[PDB]
Amino acid sequence: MVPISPIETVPVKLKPGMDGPKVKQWPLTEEKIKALVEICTEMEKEGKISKIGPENPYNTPVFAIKKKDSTKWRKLVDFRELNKRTQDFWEVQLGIPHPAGLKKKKSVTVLDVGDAYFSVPLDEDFRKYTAFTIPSINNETPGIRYQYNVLPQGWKGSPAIFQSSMTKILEPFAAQNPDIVIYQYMDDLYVGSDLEIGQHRTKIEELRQHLLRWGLTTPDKKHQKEPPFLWMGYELHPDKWTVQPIVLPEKDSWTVNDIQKLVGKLNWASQIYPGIKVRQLSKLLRGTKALTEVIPLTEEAELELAENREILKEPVHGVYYDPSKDLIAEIQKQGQGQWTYQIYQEPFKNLKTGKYARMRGAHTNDVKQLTEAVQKITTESIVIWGKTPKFKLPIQKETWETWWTEYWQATWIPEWEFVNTPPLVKLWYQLEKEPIVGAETFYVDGAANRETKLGKAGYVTNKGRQKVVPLTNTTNQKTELQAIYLALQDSGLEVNIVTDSQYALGIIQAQPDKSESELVNQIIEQLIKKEKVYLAWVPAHKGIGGNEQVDKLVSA
Amino acid sequence: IETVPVKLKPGMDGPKVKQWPLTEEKIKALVEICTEMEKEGKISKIGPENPYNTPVFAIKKKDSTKWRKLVDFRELNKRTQDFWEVQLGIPHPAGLKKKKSVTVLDVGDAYFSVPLDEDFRKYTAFTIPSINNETPGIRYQYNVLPQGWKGSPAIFQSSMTKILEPFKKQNPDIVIYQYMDDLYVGSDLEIGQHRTKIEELRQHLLRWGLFLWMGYELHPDKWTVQPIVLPEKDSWTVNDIQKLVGKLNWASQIYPGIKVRQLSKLLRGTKALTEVIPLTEEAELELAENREILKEPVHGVYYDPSKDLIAEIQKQGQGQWTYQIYQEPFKNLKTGKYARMRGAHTNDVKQLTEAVQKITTESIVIWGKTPKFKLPIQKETWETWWTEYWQATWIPEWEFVNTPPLVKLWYQ
Ligand SMILES: Cc1cc(/C=C/C#N)cc(C)c1Nc1ccnc(Nc2ccc(C#N)cc2)n1
Ligand SMILES: Cc1c(CO)cnn1-c1ccc(F)cc1
Ligand SMILES: Cc1c(CO)cnn1-c1ccc(F)cc1
Ligand SMILES: [Mg+2]
Question: Where are the annotated segments for RT 'primer grip' (chain B)?
Answer without folding.
Answer: 211-219
